[PDB]
Amino acid sequence: MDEFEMIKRNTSEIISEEELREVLKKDEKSAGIGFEPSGKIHLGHYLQIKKMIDLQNAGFDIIIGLADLHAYLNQKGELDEIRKIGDYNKKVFEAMGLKAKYVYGSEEQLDKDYTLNVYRLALKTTLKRARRSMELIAREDENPKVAEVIYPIMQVNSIHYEGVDVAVGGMEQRKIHMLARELLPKKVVCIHNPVLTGLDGEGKMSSSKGNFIAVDDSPEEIRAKIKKAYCPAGVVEGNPIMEIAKYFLEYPLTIKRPEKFGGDLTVNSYEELESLFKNKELHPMRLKNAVAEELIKILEPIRKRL
Amino acid sequence: MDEFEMIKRNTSEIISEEELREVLKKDEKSAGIGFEPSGKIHLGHYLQIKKMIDLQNAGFDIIIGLADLHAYLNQKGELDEIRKIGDYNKKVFEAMGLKAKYVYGSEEQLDKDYTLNVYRLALKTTLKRARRSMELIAREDENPKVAEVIYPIMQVNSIHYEGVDVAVGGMEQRKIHMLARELLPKKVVCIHNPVLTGLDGEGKMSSSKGNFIAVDDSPEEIRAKIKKAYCPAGVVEGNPIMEIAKYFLEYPLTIKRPEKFGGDLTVNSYEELESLFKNKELHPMRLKNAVAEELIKILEPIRKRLSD
Ligand SMILES: N[C@@H](Cc1ccc(OCc2ccccc2[N+](=O)[O-])cc1)C(=O)O
Ligand SMILES: N[C@@H](Cc1ccc(OCc2ccccc2[N+](=O)[O-])cc1)C(=O)O
């Protein structure tokens, strides 16, 4: 019910709870997230988009940032019209149902007033702090580059020119946000979403890793990717199919099971599901076939809307 | 003599010797230097301006850069209207005889096309490279700031957007210029002028430490400032008064001396003067007063034009 807990849902960290409550009292508020344009949109993008719609529905005006520059800066893509990728990216977010104010990076990040504050910011940032903020975002080049330390201050100075009271992002962005809370004049609050494990089970879910499900993928592809996933019995930590169960699932839900071995088991909470998978009452194969079907149902509207 | 040797004169290093010749053969040609604007213009600035005039005499169109932006980036000053300070510096350089295209930094270091190339350059520059190039130009901060690593690329990028075939500066700016030779497509020629030691002798000449002789200093000060200089008999290295004779005074010179100790002696070259000090044949009080009197003469026209 309460808009606080609706926002706090599935959020690993909120800095801070109290500070959020004070700016909830304000009449007009803004929340902002930024995405580097990626070819295929995966589930980790959806989870963040969910929380923006939660803030949007809570009265927030939403700013979504497309970091077309950081593609060159972080060597993500040496393509000119990456905006074309971001166009589709912008379209996919609208298909999910988030009407926001999409601000491309190249529009606002070469202005003289902004570039000045970037140097002003570099006057207060130390080399050690900047590298520390990029331990989970950068590429960790053997011969590191000057662009690595420019990425955080541009990230921090962007938050300023967007003036968003709420700054959202993955847990990867925790350190740049703490740096931004230190240097920026206004103390924006930070909402950090959990990092999804991949279907490989070894690393985080990223498109380049290939361990990703796409809202654009075909129903049979979702069946196959899940069928091969790292779903171990008695494992809830590091289990990606259990992560899908925690976030993108709707309760109650019916799991088909013949009565000889148990019976149709309707679950009403992930904590119920977590207790049954941990004590080995539910088999991974059964969990995979169940989680797959709802995901196909949930991503199907977003699919046809494209 | 020839425009080469006039340009080589009193230069520590020229990268490259063969390249400068090819630049001189080109009819149209440009050379550029840059200065962080300071309140008082000491002798160390005059030496750099001289070599621009030597480049200007050879036909090089000259560009002087005023690093108004780097007044904050290196924390040289937090004052806003540094322009008025640098505007006084403009006329000061003209009195020395240098008419040039003065380009303020802030008027171009914030453009869209310039800023973008800074990032594109940061995608080819490593952190260790920029940190080493800043060794002689740093503030020796305990916790280094990101602005220290940003500074050299802006220089390397400023050199590009000025397209100056000849990039000239102090010997401390060597590594920044060696970075521009590696990164920039046009291999600009580098001319490195020596570093003048300060009157204290322990440090170098800077407007901060106060061990400087300004071109607007009053004639009695030049005598008193030189009177308390580190002039060690028999040492030419690290001798500031010796360096004044090497780069600024004109020859031949006759030092006044009673006959009993050798009489008035005629020195026709700094090498002869350098030989006498090593051979103890010349006392510092003599060399001090002699160097001072010749200096006020040289600084007299520049000093008068500033007045009124
Ligand atoms: N680091 C991300 C990419 C990224 C790049 C720039 C960026 O700053 C812009 C911004 C910042 C805070 C609030 C709102 C906005 N905004 O412009 O809407 C945000 C994200 C990644 O690793 O994907
Ligand atoms: N480093 C100096 C100050 C300094 C600042 C900027 C600078 O680059 C600009 C430039 C460079 C070469 C040719 C032309 C131009 N230009 O843009 O006119 C050069 C020197 C000091 O520490 O005193």
Author numbering:
A (entry chain A): 1 to 306
B (entry chain B): 1 to 308
Provide the authors' original text about this structure.
In the present study, we revealed the structural basis for the recognition of O-(2-nitrobenzyl)-L-tyrosine (oNBTyr) by its specific variant of Methanocaldococcus jannaschii tyrosyl-tRNA synthetase (oNBTyrRS), and then demonstrated its potential availability for time-resolved X-ray crystallography. In contrast, the genetic encoding of caged amino acids offers a more facile and robust approach for biosynthesizing the photoresponsive proteins. These synthetic amino acids are recognized by specific variants of aminoacyl-tRNA synthetase and attach to tRNA, which in turn translates codons (mostly the UAG stop codon) assigned to the amino acids. Thus, cell-free protein synthesis of caged proteins with oNBTyr could facilitate time-resolved structural analysis of proteins, including medically important membrane proteins.
In the present study, we determined the crystal structure of another archaeal tyrosyl-tRNA synthetase variant (oNBTyrRS) complexed with O-(2-nitrobenzyl)-L-tyrosine. The five mutated residues play essential roles in the recognition of the structural features of oNBTyr. Furthermore, these residues, together with the oxygen of the nitro group, formed a hydrogen-bonding network, which was stabilized by the participation of Ser158. Although the chemical structure of oNPTyr was larger than that of oNBTyr, the fitting model showed no structural distortion. The nitro group of the leaving group forms a polar interaction only with the main chain of Ala70 in the hydrophobic environment. It provides a structural basis for the recognition of caged tyrosine, oNBTyr by mutant TyrRS.
